[PDB]
RNA sequence: AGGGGAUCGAAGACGAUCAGAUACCGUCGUAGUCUUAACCAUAAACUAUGCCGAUUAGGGAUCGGACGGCGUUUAUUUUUGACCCGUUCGGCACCUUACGAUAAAUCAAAAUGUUUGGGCUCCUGGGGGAGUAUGGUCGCAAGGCUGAAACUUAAAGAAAUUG
């Protein structure tokens, strides 16, 4: 509720406004362990729960019930993430799940289909991912068509900012939780493909943690 | 499912091996599958060693040894408590147990 | 027995590149293989390559510089007209902007884009991107 | 990187591994930077000018990064007769 | 000599110090990755490491050390008894934190433990006995320099110093020489030829 | 007859904070503890005094791991600067004949590096 | 029970929110 | 169909146990168990993992052949044989590891597959009915090979977790 006390060096640096934006943190691949980092840079992040499911466990009296929650976050302009958490009571699960969703926000790469006319709208390449017997593939699509996908993964693609794509699924897609994790891995690998336009060598610079001096 | 990688037999590179007779129930098991124990002991027990010594007529005497090699089926193996059930991770350990050399 | 020296060469290159090596060795060397390597070189996907000449068949040692994703071969050499050549580029290339499909025609073996510029067709032998 | 009219449109441009050339993805923990100081004629270390290298987690995990560093240092004239091809 | 002058060649006294502590004796096992750092294997005996490559690799490690802005960001680890005193004296002479004995796993990952640290560099005596430190270092992107013998894992170790790694005198001598180089490259010693006033036996171990 | 954690922690903290004012005699520690502490039970005060007087009986005869008091630490860093006058590695004084012993390919290594002037004697080693 | 809690909470944005009659 | 027939022992006959015991336990005991000349062609015939070819990681054992070396032992003694150190070819296997694969157990192949094409042959499509009926074919017979339909059902099944 009230103003937060930094625990890490990065937290102190953000508090002093010594770092510009998230893209250098992404460039240097630094771990994030505190959810106030994301919302200090990115307001208006929409969150939306998929469903809540009970889980059992046998005990002397009977069966012990816990509740599992599915939560994803996104800004519809290139940032998306999800979190999974179970707890003994539903309400705790939703708030705690939101924290992991904020902690797992990643950037996406958006490309062109054919000719370029500003505001990239589709995937740069075709990418796919697998998580335990579920495979989801994304294909670039021409401008104008809508999203052709299941209702579950259409929301994730809508919140990721991708405008045109083709989708195909294989394996046992009945596991909704696994399906979302497979789509998230496929989107996570968009920046992992080396297109020919990235062949130019880049210059390495020292990280903000190294070249800044933290407060006591 | 495989409970053991070697099928509990120790036989790779051949098709057949002649069986043997269990020393307790007279069952037939393959020789490579049976459990083999070699035992070396004295003819007489340690309390009787002196009684034989002073009842001998050869001044100092050395009692002879006795040598046996017993072999059992697995059904008689864990009923005679020669070997016992081990844990899942402890199954894959074929080093002989370290016999106590101090006995407290 | 050995049924595709081209397949052996591309498979060895793909394995070494995926595992991060810098040099590759190819046991059998042929004219079609070298003509394929020159196409790769003209687009910068590889570096120097050397063909040692023993009297049996010769060998190849290629120098890698990263930058290469995958290079495969189609084993049954289909017959493709000029009009349906865009089916294949729609099928087995991540995007139209980059990537090449290697063809064999009466004017030598060549990539699909300048082969389209030459307005010629033939048989398909492989691809790389 | 993509372009439409000469202006950058990519959200950010990632870096490349020095040992293998693979791009280091975001959230790829296990990728490190190595900074090398610069010495003067009398042996003191001048402050603020340094040489930077980057290694990915993939190349680090199998463990040849020590030899890759030897290769890069020898190429940049930091070491003598430590790396060679048999 | 693009980035190094000729004053960094090892002096005869230094090589003397090296060959007086039997730091050139290895184990029967020969790792494949340490093959470059092998002179020859003894006929009916152990491998022999090349001390000449040791000198530059030690200098390079010192050049890594100096690049850190404030010395308090460097952390040095030791678990075996033979390196406790040498690591602590290294921590006192330079600026660095030292962890001797048990490591308390979760130090680099959990932010509520008492021994919570955010280092920029890690120095390890032995990768085999300090595998946990390297394993947790692999999660948050910190380079490690470590002392290695002829047989030793090279998992996630950017810089390796070839040494005996098991002798009583060798570990202390190497830690002492590394500290000397760090001070020499800074302005503390002020001169390459002048000798240091601390005795090498100070970085040793005593039974009681 | 095993003492719980509350006594274990109270005995350790009292011993390390206030070492010299109390001794091996149980009677003295009985009156020492309650004056310098706030304890709500008489038997619990007895529990602490009885166990705490046990510690100094074994500390008096050799130190024990897990316990450190003000007098004890200061002894460590005074003793840890011990250093001889002649180095154990140094052999010009330690060995009567300054020249030392190495093996053949070590001498060859010296030949490669150029430090030929070191006076050493080479002896072959082989068993086979 | 899980369905009951989701409507009851009235503090989160669900995928589909029913409108009474 | 002949020879041989010690020992075990289907069928069978007794003694116990048991409420019953045509069984488990004990004493006997025919065909059979062996061999010569001909049939039969099925087994959890199992590595439940087809055959040829290429590449991919560290280790130390071990069987056969060849090559190099410091020594010991020993003989009508040397060269040979035995032991020791290192390299290589071809096998039956093993330990660690995952950059990889799978639902998982686990795997140097079960890897190089959504970024899907090295060559060839065979087999399967929810569970029962059913390897059944019928036709054909081989066999002295026992049986082998090939092989349905009517009807019925919302679950059978695999790997792992807590009790
Ligand atoms: Mg065989
Ligand atoms: Mg068989
Ligand atoms: Mg007749
Ligand atoms: Mg007959
Ligand atoms: Mg009977
Ligand atoms: Mg009988
Ligand atoms: Mg059959
Ligand atoms: Mg079969
Ligand atoms: Mg078979
Ligand atoms: Mg020989
Ligand atoms: Mg079932
Ligand atoms: Mg089951
Ligand atoms: Zn038995």
UniProtKB/TrEMBL annotation, chain A:
Q: Name one GO biological process term.
A: translation
Which residues, by range, are in coiled-coil regions?
none
What positions does the domain S5 DRBM occupy?
45-108
Q: Name one GO molecular function term.
A: RNA binding
Q: Which UniProt keywords apply?
A: Ribonucleoprotein, Ribosomal protein
What's any one GO cellular component for it? cytosolic small ribosomal subunit
Top-rank taxon, per record? Eukaryota
- What family does the Swiss-Prot or TrEMBL record give for this protein? Belongs to the universal ribosomal protein uS5 family.
Descriptive protein name = Small ribosomal subunit protein uS5
Q: Which organism is it from?
A: Chaetomium thermophilum (strain DSM 1495 / CBS 144.50 / IMI 039719) (Thermochaetoides thermophila)
Automatic annotation (TrEMBL), chain B:
Can you name a GO cellular component term? Answer: cytosolic small ribosomal subunit
Q: Keyword set for this entry?
A: Metal-binding, Ribonucleoprotein, Ribosomal protein, Zinc
Report any one BP term from Gene Ontology: translation
What PROSITE patterns would the database entry show?
Answer: RIBOSOMAL_S26E (PS00733)
The molecular function terms in GO held by this entry are: mRNA binding; structural constituent of ribosome
Pfam families (alphabetical): Ribosomal_S26e (PF01283)
Top-rank taxon: Eukaryota
- In the UniProt record, does the keyword Zinc occur? yes
Q: Indicate yes or no for the key word Transport.
A: no
Transmembrane residues, as ranges? none
Q: Read off the InterPro entries from this record.
A: Ribosomal_eS26 (IPR000892), Ribosomal_eS26_CS (IPR047864), Ribosomal_eS26_sf (IPR038551)
Looking up Gene3D superfamilies in the UniProt record yields:
Ribosomal protein S26e
The UniProt entry's coiled-coil ranges are none
Indicate which residues the UniProt annotation says bind Zn(2+): 22, 25, 73, 76
**Which protein family is named in the record?**
Belongs to the eukaryotic ribosomal protein eS26 family.
In Swiss-Prot or TrEMBL terms, this protein is called 40S ribosomal protein S26
User: What species was this sequence derived from?
Assistant: Chaetomium thermophilum (strain DSM 1495 / CBS 144.50 / IMI 039719) (Thermochaetoides thermophila)
UniProtKB/TrEMBL annotation, chain D:
Which domain of life, per UniProt?
Answer: Eukaryota
Task: Tell me yes or no: is Ribonucleoprotein among this UniProt entry's keywords.
Answer: yes
Q: Which Gene Ontology cellular-component terms appear in the entry?
A: cytosolic ribosome; ribonucleoprotein complex
Keyword Ribosomal protein attached: yes
Gene3D superfamilies found in the cross-reference section: 3.30.1230.20
Query: What's any GO biological process attached to this entry?
Result: ribosomal small subunit biogenesis
GO molecular function: any one?
A: structural constituent of ribosome
Q: Which terms are listed as keywords in the entry?
A: Ribonucleoprotein, Ribosomal protein
Q: Which PANTHER family match?
A: 40S RIBOSOMAL PROTEIN S21
Family, similarity comment = Belongs to the eukaryotic ribosomal protein eS21 family.
Protein name, UniProt field: 40S ribosomal protein S21-like protein
From TrEMBL, chain G:
Tell me where in or outside the cell this protein is found. Answer: Cytoplasm
Residues in coiled coil: none
Q: What is this protein called?
A: Hyaluronan/mRNA-binding protein domain-containing protein
Q: What species is given as this protein's source?
A: Chaetomium thermophilum (strain DSM 1495 / CBS 144.50 / IMI 039719) (Thermochaetoides thermophila)
């Amino acid at each position: 509720e009230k103003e937060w006390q930094p625990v890490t060096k990065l937290g102190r640096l953000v508090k002093a406004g010594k770092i510009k934006s998230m893209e250098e943190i992404y460039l240097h691949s630094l771990p994030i362990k505190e959810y106030q980092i994301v919302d200090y840079f990115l307001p208006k992040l929409k969150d939306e729960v998929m469903k809540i499911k009970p889980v059992q466990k046998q005990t002397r009296a009977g069966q012990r019930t816990r509740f599992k929650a599915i939560v994803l976050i996104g800004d519809s302009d290139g940032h998306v993430g999800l979190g999974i958490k179970t707890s003994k009571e539903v309400a705790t699960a939703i708030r705690a799940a939101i924290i992991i969703a904020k902690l797992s926000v990643i950037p996406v790469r958006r490309g062109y289909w054919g000719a370029n006319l500003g505001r990239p709208h589709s995937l740069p390449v075709k990418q796919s991912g697998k998580c335990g017997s579920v495979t989801v593939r994304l294909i670039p699509a021409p401008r104008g068509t809508s999203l052709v996908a299941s209702p579950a993964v259409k929301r994730l693609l809508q919140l990721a900012g991708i405008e045109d794509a083709y989708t195909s699924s294989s394996g046992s897609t009945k596991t909704l939780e696994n399906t979302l994790k497979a789509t998230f891995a496929a989107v996570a690998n968009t920046y992992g493909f080396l297109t020919p336009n990235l062949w130019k060598e880049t210059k390495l610079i020292r990280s903000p943690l190294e070249e800044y001096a933290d407060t006591l | 499912v495989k409970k053991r990688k070697n099928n509990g037999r120790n036989k790779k590179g051949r098709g057949h091996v002649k069986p043997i007779r269990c020393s307790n129930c007279a069952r037939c098991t393959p020789k490579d599958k049976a459990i083999k124990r070699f035992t070396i002991r004295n003819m007489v027990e340690s309390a009787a060693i002196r009684d034989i010594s002073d009842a001998s007529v050869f001044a100092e005497y050395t009692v002879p040894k006795m040598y046996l090699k017993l072999q059992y089926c697995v059904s008689c193996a864990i009923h005679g408590k020669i070997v016992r059930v081990r844990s899942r991770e402890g199954r894959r350990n074929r080093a002989p147990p370290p016999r106590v050399r101090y006995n407290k | 027995v050995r049924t595709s020296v081209l397949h052996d060469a591309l498979n060895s290159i793909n394995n070494a590149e995926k595992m991060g090596k810098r040099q590759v060795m190819i046991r059998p060397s042929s004219k079609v293989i070298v003509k394929f390597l020159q196409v790769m070189q003209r687009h910068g996907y590889i570096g120097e390559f050397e063909e040692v000449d023993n009297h049996r068949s010769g060998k190849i040692v290629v120098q890698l510089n990263g930058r290469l994703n995958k290079c495969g071969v189609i084993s049954p050499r289909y017959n493709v007209r000029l009009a349906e050549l865009e089916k294949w580029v729609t099928k087995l290339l991540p995007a139209r902007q980059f990537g090449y499909v290697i063809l064999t025609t009466s004017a030598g073996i060549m990539d699909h884009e300048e082969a389209r510029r030459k307005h010629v067709a033939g048989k398909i032998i492989g691809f790389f991107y | 990187m993509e372009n439409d009219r000469g202006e950058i449109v990519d959200l950010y441009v990632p870096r490349k591994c020095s040992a293998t050339g693979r791009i280091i993805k975001a959230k790829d923990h296990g990728s490190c930077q190595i900074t090398i100081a610069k010495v003067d004629e009398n042996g003191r270390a001048i402050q603020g000018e340094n040489i930077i290298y980057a290694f990915s987690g993939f190349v680090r995990a199998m463990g040849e990064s020590d030899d890759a560093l030897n290769r890069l240092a020898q190429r940049d004239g930091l070491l003598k007769n430590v790396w060679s091809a048999q | 000599p693009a980035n190094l002058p000729s004053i960094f060649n090892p002096t005869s006294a230094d090589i003397e110090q090296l060959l007086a502590a039997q730091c050139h004796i290895g184990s029967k096992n020969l790792n494949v990755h340490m093959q470059p750092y092998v002179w020859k294997t003894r006929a009916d005996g152990v491998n022999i490491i090349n001390l000449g490559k040791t000198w530059e690799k030690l200098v390079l490690a010192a050049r890594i050390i100096v690049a850190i802005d404030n010395p308090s960001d460097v952390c040095v680890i030791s678990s075996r008894p033979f390196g406790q005193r040498a690591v602590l004296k290294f921590a006192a002479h330079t600026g660095a934190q030292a962890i001797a004995g048990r490591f308390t796993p979760g130090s680099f990952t959990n932010y509520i433990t008492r021994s919570f640290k955010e280092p920029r560099l890690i120095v390890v005596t032995d990768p085999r006995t300090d595998a946990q430190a390297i394993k947790e270092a692999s999660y948050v992107n910190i380079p490690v320099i470590a002392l290695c013998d002829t047989d030793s894992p090279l998992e996630y170790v950017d810089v390796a110093i070839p040494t005996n790694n098991k002798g009583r005198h060798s570990v202390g001598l190497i830690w002492w020489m590394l500290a000397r180089e760090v001070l020499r490259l800074r302005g503390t010693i002020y001169n390459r030829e002048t000798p240091w006033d601390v005795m090498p036996d100070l970085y040793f171990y005593r039974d009681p | 007859r095993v003492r719980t954690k509350t006594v274990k922690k109270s005995a350790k903290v009292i011993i390390e904070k206030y070492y010299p004012r109390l001794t091996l005699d149980f009677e003295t520690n009985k009156r020492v503890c309650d004056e310098i502490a706030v304890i709500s039970s008489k038997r619990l005060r007895n529990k602490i005094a009885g166990y705490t007087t046990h510690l100094m009986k074994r500390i008096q005869r050799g130190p024990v791991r897990g316990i450190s008091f003000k007098l004890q630490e200061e002894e460590r860093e005074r003793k840890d600067q011990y250093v001889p006058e002649v180095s154990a590695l140094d052999f010009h004084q330690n060995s009567e004949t300054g020249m030392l012993d190495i093996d053949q390919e070590t001498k060859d290594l010296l030949k490669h590096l150029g430090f030929d002037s070191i006076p050493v004697n080479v002896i072959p080693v082989t068993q086979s | 029970e899980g369905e009951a809690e989701l409507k009851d909470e009235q503090a989160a944005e669900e995928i589909a929110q029913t409108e009474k009659k």
